Amino acid sequence: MYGKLNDLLEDLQEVLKHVNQHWQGGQKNMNKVDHHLQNVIEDIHDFMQGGGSGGKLQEMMKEFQQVLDEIKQQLQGGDNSLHNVHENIKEIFHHLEELVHR
Numbered sequence: 001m002y003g004k005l006n007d008l009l010e011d012l013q014e015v016l017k018h019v020n021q022h023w024q025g026g027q028k029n030m031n032k033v034d035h036h037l038q039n040v041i042e043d044i045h046d047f048m049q050g051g052g053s054g055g056k057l058q059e060m061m062k063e064f065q066q067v068l069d070e071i072k073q074q075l076q077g078g079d080n081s082l083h084n085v086h087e088n089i090k091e092i093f094h095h096l097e098e099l100v101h102r
Contacts, residue, residue: 022081
């Protein structure tokens with residue numbers, strides 16, 4: 001149980017927090033999406049337990065890529081803020097599969 005996950009988890013729930021305030025192009029997604037990550041952020045937190053849930057992570061992976069391609073579409077509008085946060089998930093999301101690609 002290294003802990004870096006908290007870095008992925010905390011860094012993930014953050015982009016989600018700095019995003020719910022800069023959401024644009026569908027004030028209805030800010031919610032539907034909140035459930036997409038909430039379920040994921042929980043997976044990462046569950047990655048430290050077995051410090052290797054490559055079997056439980058590849059699961060939210062789809063839910064993870066479901067948000068990355070979702071908010072990215074919200075960048076259509078005054079969401080120039082997401083452009084700064086939406087850029088996180090890209091590396092952040094691929095950052096977890098990296099703590100397991102060991």
